[PDB]
Amino acid sequence: PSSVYVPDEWEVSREKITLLRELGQGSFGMVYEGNARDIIKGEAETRVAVKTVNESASLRERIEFLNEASVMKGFTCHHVVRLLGVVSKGQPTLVVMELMAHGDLKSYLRSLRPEAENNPGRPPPTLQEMIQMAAEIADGMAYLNAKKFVHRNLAARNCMVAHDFTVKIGDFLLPVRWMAPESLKDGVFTTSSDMWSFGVVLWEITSLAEQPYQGLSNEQVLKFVMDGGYLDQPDNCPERVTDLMRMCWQFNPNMRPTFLEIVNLLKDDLHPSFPEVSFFHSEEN
Numbered sequence: 001p002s003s004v005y006v007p008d009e010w011e012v013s014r015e016k017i018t019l020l021r022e023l024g025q026g027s028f029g030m031v032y033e034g035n036a037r038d039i040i041k042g043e044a045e046t047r048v049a050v051k052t053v054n055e056s057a058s059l060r061e062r063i064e065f066l067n068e069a070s071v072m073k074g075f076t077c078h079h080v081v082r083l084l085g086v087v088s089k090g091q092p093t094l095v096v097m098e099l100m101a102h103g104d105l106k107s108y109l110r111s112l113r114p115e116a117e118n119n120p121g122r123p124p125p126t127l128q129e130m131i132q133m134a135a136e137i138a139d140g141m142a143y144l145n146a147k148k149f150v151h152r153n154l155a156a157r158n159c160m161v162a163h164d165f166t167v168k169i170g171d172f173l174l175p176v177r178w179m180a181p182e183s184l185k186d187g188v189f190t191t192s193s194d195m196w197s198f199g200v201v202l203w204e205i206t207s208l209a210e211q212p213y214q215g216l217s218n219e220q221v222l223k224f225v226m227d228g229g230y231l232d233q234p235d236n237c238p239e240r241v242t243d244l245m246r247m248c249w250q251f252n253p254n255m256r257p258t259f260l261e262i263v264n265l266l267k268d269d270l271h272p273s274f275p276e277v278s279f280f281h282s283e284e285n
């Protein structure tokens with residue numbers, strides 16, 4: 001493992017980063033809420049998420065932390081959480097990401113339940129909002145597929161929610177309840193198995209983040225899904241999203257839609273800004 005990171009236009013002066021509070025444990029270590037001065041042209045200050053590697057990390061893990069930041073430089077998708085800057089001079093290394101103020105999608109969904117103690121005084125997602133979420137997630141996944149990344153871990157806990165409620169793909173032992181039968185059987189992960197996970201995300205949206213296969217152990221889920229089992233439809237689930245889930249959960253991975261096919265299905269009734277920001281409508285597609 002050697003440093004591929006070139007201290008370039010992405011390099012941010014450490015003193016430009018002010019840390020406000022802990023947000024929680026990320027993959028590599030603590031994630032902080034921060035404020036960054038003059039990192040984006042036209043903005044004097046930018047709210048940011050700041051990732052760090054935990055103190056127990058090896059030298060290798062620190063190098064791998066910085067190499068991941070280097071990879072993220074190549075991504076410019078509105079529906080994938082974006083890198084803003086890197087502090088690689090001295091320790092600790094800081095990886096500065098766009099802030100997603102409403103946190104992960106699973107927790108956000110669970111907050112909108114009628115019984116929730118942390119309910120923000122708003123109704124649960126409307127059909128329109130759920131379709132919008134689905135399209136945004138699908139577009140972000142379409143982009144990563146075009147970049148030749150198989151996600152392997154798609155779940156509501158791994159999607160993030162912005163200030164304006166835009167949903168984006170976040171960070172990319174086994175999550176068996178989100179896994180396709182062929183992955184459970186042979187450990188084969190493809191964009192087609194990512195599509196299976198996408199259907200589970202739709203199920204999480206329409207159940208306000210219930211635990212998939214509640215009342216079944218992980219061993220029972222493994223067998224159930226490999227045998228051709230899949231999730232039941234949530235109570236009063238909109239027909240349109242039920243239809244998407246059905247496609248996603250075809251046993252033959254060849255018979256599942258692609259992420260571009262999903263966006264295309266949903267494109268005719270989305271927010272006006274969608275074609276201006278999406279990978280789907282971009283010249284890159």
Ligand SMILES: CNC(=O)c1c(F)cccc1Nc1nc(Nc2cc3c(ccn3C(=O)CN(C)C)cc2OC)nc2[nH]ccc12
Pocket residue numbers: 023024025026027031033049081097098099100101102103104107160171
């Ligand atoms: C892979 N996990 C993370 O990166 C992560 C985490 F594990 C915990 C907390 C934050 C993480 N990452 C990011 N968070 C945010 N915004 C954000 C998330 C928040 C909260 C409060 C609970 N949150 C959770 O998501 C807790 N949840 C994991 C249970 C506040 C936030 O901004 C005000 N923006 C981000 N941008 C890039 C990473 C990131």
